[PDB]
A paper describes a structure:
Here we demonstrate that broadly neutralizing antibodies can be isolated from peripheral blood mononuclear cells of convalescent patients using SARS-CoV-2 receptor binding domains carrying epitope-specific mutations. Most of the neutralizing antibodies bind the spike receptor binding domain (RBD), and in particular class 1 and 2 epitopes within the receptor binding motif (RBM), directly blocking interaction with the human angiotensin converting enzyme receptor 2 (ACE2).
The finding that GAR01 and GAR03 are broadly cross-specific and bind to epitopes conserved in SARS-CoV-2, SARS-CoV-1, pangolin CoV and bat RaTG12-CoV (but do not compete with ACE2 nor CR3022) indicate that these two antibodies may be rare binders falling into the class 5 epitope bin. To investigate this hypothesis, we performed BLI competition assays with the class 5 antibody S2H9712, and confirmed that binding of both antibodies is indeed consistent with the class 5 classification. Subsequently, we crystalized the GAR03 Fab in complex with the RBD and solved the structure by X-ray crystallography to 2.75 Å resolution (middle and right-hand panels), confirming the binding mode suggested by cryoEM, whereby the bulk of the contact interface is mediated by the antibody light chain, and where the binding epitope is well separated from Omicron variant mutation positions (positions highlighted in yellow).
Author numbering:
A (entry chain L): 1 to 212
B (entry chain H): 1 to 219
C (entry chain R): 333 to 518, 522 to 528
D (entry chain B): 1 to 213
E (entry chain A): 1 to 221
The structure:
């Protein structure tokens, strides 16, 4: 494997910026470097090959450069349909090698999350489990912190997080934090709290419920 | 009209084998070389293998040599990838692509392969009911908890598709149990909690399960 | 007796591209080799298998004068046991090579403002050239798993590439005329002695 | 890309020596080859690599290349050397790597008498005039070397219309034969009192007349 | 001995294509390039291109780029040359030659050549007329009589005399191509003038391309 190194691994830009992504080869690959685009959940789209030759349908604002070991992809006048993950791949020698990827997301303005807490449903409690859910909706950037306090006692090793991809319209993120408990541990405590910190909050927001 | 449709993917246990197919139409199959590419959940793209137009020369990736075998039947216009000695590193979405004058110009739809000892189990759905203490004259959050399912694809629709704005379906997390769980939520006007109904539809085709679950307000 | 026409090889107005290099066999003449050695307007004069001084004293069965044009940093490849685009796909010397490689800078002749893209070299090949073999074919090279059938594209490249000599280029990228003299042994071509 | 310009014709006598010049700029940069082509046959390689001759080629053939002219020296010239001689190079110094030939040079060995033309002239057959057509057939035979100049005339006044003449062709005896046809209408044949075929060779002039009826 | 055996003659109408073959004998087909040379009637040699039997690759002269295709068959050691969109200018003997091993590049061995004739004339049998002898065709002891073979296409035509028995004195002359495109030749025999009434003179004409055989008696006027 020749092995390819991309830089940066992630970056943010506004619509209309011009962005460069670097791809480095461990060995000399002449000018035989391809660039791929992939949007979350969909099949990859081959953009360029031979370092600079566009594929059918690819806009000319995608310009590739480079020879030997150092290659670059320059995307001018960024457009909403261009924000995706970009991979490089040498096609000079088998085995073909892909890069680590570069995730390109929109910059957007700082937004604070709206926090909601959900007790476990009685239909679930009848089974014997208790899942408590906290929701951080429509925030940016994606860096947030969720601390679970059961009777003002911090929890550890019993919660799980899941974040969405940037939304098509508001370009925001959303997070689901689930506290897992047995019903035995659940009905032994009164107040359940979800403490949330984020760049857009002046002070930590808490949403809490009492079993009932 | 040029098409690459895949089949064969699904759940296999560690060590066992699986044969993936990639059926072709709308072009002369024997004129084109064919590649396999895969992608682990949340990981990057990994080139797997390539096969010459006429069978003949084949090549593989380093992390795949010896265990997988690429092949094709030109009379059936079909490409295959045989999979053996299966480990968790091989749990991925597998794509076939054709190598043409215009590059990898056409791709398959992708078939999942989930290697693990677990059994195909449909999910349990629980309503995340909106707070009756909702801020009033504002927004109210409600959703459905899709717990303990395997293997993973799960689709969530709201009011059978009528409700599309404000919906967030979270990516699934592979629980320590080996099963998957995810939540889908939606924000609605706090006033219409009484009048408008709110139903989530969860479908898990690996187990042929379709659940419609009633999210009503609660105190 | 007969004069070996080395001047017509060296001072030819036009030279061939390296991919289609020219070979002139020299025979039935008395060669004066110091004409070249004793007058160094050449940048390289490397001989193999013979010493340059003793060339006027030896006899050989035949002489071949191969001529072509490359760029400066490629003259190193015109030697036995070299590797590179030139030695592998264009002009290969054998391991038992007996002769001399002569080169000189031709920037004043083969470069022009705007670029002289007349000179070509071969970029790929299925196998490396055997010694003293010549390939002048122009089949689209199939670098991938799909037949090209005459159309260029992904992994389907025209096999020859132009040089692009401009007078402002660095000396390593300037054009160089090259004459390779191969001495076949076994006395049709002899020195003055 | 370069063009090799040979001399179209070079003529000598038996026992003499003929020299055929092949011309091109810097022709000494390449190896000139020479082929012999006898009438109605394939070329045969006579000299290769400027001076080397193939097996079974007489030593009286010799080659040389000294600058911008290469010459084939054919000495002690025999009769079987009467042929077309072509020079050839391989030129890749131009736009496309091509094999180039010259225009050729015919060797007329010019070693035989100056035999005069035999001429017979035929009127139109009665069957042809019945078919509403007419042809006069002028047959020239046993003439050597291999030229001839033909002219028709209706009552001494030339015709020029309806004439079709063969190019001189060697006979078994080794003289050259040729033929000329004059296409007439039946009325044009009977309108005039005499058509004549005139044959000119070197300085000769032989005229044969035919009248109607 | 290395031998280059080509294919038979071809007569084509303008706009058609022709595919000449050339089988190689006493060497390794895959070790020598095959070049194709062309020669107009009584004119110079014209090079067309080279084919490499091993690789199958080609190289053509620009004059023929786009109308010539040079292929091969390894199994039966045969090189093919195909010229399309033919015109009368393409009337020529088409030659097949092996390029030397020496990158010097000389054609060491040639082929017999294939004559392809391009003309718009269609196949027509000949009208044969007697050229009767006259006492004005004599030299006192021997007269001249013949047969005129008029308007035919294509060549060749064969002429014999008195059932192929009269051979001493026959002189069949080369044909002429007219402005119309049709051929005409004459065949004359010089015969003792003591036997114009003693013996008869029939002339046999054959034009196989039209399956036309004609016999003509040549009595005096
Ligand atoms: C080329 O020309 C120069 C200048 O006349 C001359 O001195 C030189 O010897 C020539 N080259 C050869 C090989 O004779
Ligand atoms: Cl050639
Ligand atoms: Cl080709």
């Amino acid at each position: 494997n020749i092995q390819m190194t991309q830089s940066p691994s992630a970056m943010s830009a506004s619509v209309g910026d011009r962005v460069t992504i670097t791809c480095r080869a461990r060995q000399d690959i002449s000018s035989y470097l391809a660039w791929f685009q992939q949007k979350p959940g969909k099949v990859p789209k081959h953009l360029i090959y031979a370092a600079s030759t566009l594929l059918s349908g690819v806009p000319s604002r995608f310009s590739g450069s480079g020879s030997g070991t150092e290659f670059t992809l320059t995307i001018s006048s960024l457009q909403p349909e261009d924000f995706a993950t970009y991979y490089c791949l040498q096609h000079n020698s088998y085995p073909y090698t892909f890069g680590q990827g570069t995730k390109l997301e929109i910059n957007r303005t700082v937004a604070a999350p709206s926090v909601f807490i959900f007790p476990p449903s009685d239909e679930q409690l009848k089974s014997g489990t208790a899942s408590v859910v906290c929701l951080l909706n429509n925030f940016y950037p994606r860096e947030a912190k969720v601390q679970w306090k059961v009777d003002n006692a911090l929890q550890s090793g019993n919660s799980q997080e899941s974040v969405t991809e940037q939304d098509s319209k508001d370009s925001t993120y959303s997070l689901s934090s689930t506290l897992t408990l047995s019903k035995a541990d659940y009905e032994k405590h009164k107040v359940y709290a979800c403490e949330v910190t984020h760049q857009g909050l002046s002070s930590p927001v808490t949403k809490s419920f009492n079993r009932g | 009209q040029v098409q690459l449709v895949e089949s064969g993917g699904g759940v296999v246990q560690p060590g066992r084998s699986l044969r993936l197919s990639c059926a072709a139409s709308g072009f002369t199959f024997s004129s084109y070389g064919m590649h396999w590419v895969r992608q682990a959940p949340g990981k990057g793209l990994e080139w797997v293998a390539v096969i010459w137009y006429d069978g003949s020369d084949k090549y593989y990736a380093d992390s795949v040599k010896g265990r997988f075998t690429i092949s094709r039947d030109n009379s059936k216009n079909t490409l295959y990838l045989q999979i053996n000695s299966l480990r968790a590193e091989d749990t991925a979405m597998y794509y076939c692509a054709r190598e043409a004058t215009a590059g990898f110009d056409y791709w398959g739809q992708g078939n999942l392969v989930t290697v693990s000892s677990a059994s195909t189990k449909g999910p349990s759905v629980f309503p995340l009911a909106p707070s009756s203490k909702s801020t009033s004259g504002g927004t109210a959050a409600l959703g459905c908890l899709v717990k303990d399912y395997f293997p993973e694809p799960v689709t969530v629709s709201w009011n059978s598709g009528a409700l599309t704005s404000g919906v967030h379906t979270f990516p699934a997390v592979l629980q320590s149990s080996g099963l998957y769980s995810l939540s889908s939520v939606v924000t609605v006007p706090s006033s219409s909690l009484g009048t408008q109904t709110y139903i989530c539809n969860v479908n898990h085709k690996p187990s042929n399960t379709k659940v419609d679950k009633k999210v009503e307000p609660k105190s | 007796t007969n004069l070996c026409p080395f001047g017509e090889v060296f001072n030819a107005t036009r030279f061939a591209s390296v991919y289609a290099w020219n070979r002139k066999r020299i025979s039935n003449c008395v060669a004066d080799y110091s004409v070249l050695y004793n007058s160094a307007s050449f940048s390289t004069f490397k001989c193999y298998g013979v010493s340059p001084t003793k060339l006027n004293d030896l006899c050989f069965t035949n002489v071949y004068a191969d001529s072509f044009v490359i760029r400066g940093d490629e003259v190193r490849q015109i030697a036995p046991g070299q590797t590179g685009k030139i030695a592998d796909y264009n002009y290969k010397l054998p391991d038992d090579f007996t002769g001399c490689v002569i080169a000189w800078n031709s920037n004043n002749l083969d470069s022009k403002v705007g670029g002289n893209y007349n000179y070509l070299y071969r970029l790929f090949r299925k196998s490396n050239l055997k010694p003293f073999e010549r390939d002048i074919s122009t089949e689209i090279y199939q670098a991938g798993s799909t037949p090209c059938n005459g159309v260029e594209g992904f992994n389907c490249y025209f096999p020859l590439q132009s040089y692009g000599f401009q007078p402002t280029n660095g000396v390593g990228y300037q054009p160089y005329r090259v004459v390779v003299l191969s001495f076949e042994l076994l006395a049709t071509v002899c020195g003055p002695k | 890309s370069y063009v090799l310009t040979q001399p179209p014709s070079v003529a000598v006598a038996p026992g003499q020596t003929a020299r055929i010049r092949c011309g091109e700029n810097d022709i000494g940069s390449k190896n000139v080859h020479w082929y012999q082509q006898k009438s109605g046959q394939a070329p045969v390689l006579v000299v290769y690599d400027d001076s080397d001759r193939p097996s079974g080629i007489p030593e009286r053939f010799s080659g040389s290349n000294s600058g911008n002219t290469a010459t084939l020296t054919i000495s002690r010239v025999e009769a079987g050397d009467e042929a077309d001689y072509y020079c050839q190079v391989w030129d890749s110094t131009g736009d496309h790597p091509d094999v180039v030939f010259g225009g050729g040079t015919k060797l007329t060995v010019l070693g035989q008498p100056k035999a005069a033309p035999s001429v017979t002239l035929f009127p139109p057959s009665s069957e042809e005039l019945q078919a509403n057509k007419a042809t006069l057939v002028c047959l020239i035979s046993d003439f050597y070397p291999g030229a001839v100049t033909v002219a028709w005339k209706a009552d001494s006044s030339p015709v020029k219309a309806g004439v079709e003449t063969t190019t001189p062709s060697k006979q078994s005896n080794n003289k050259y034969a040729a033929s000329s046809y004059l296409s007439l209408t039946p009325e044009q044949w009977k309108s005039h009192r005499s058509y004549s075929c005139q044959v000119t060779h070197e300085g000769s002039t032989v005229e044969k007349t035919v009248a109607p009826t």
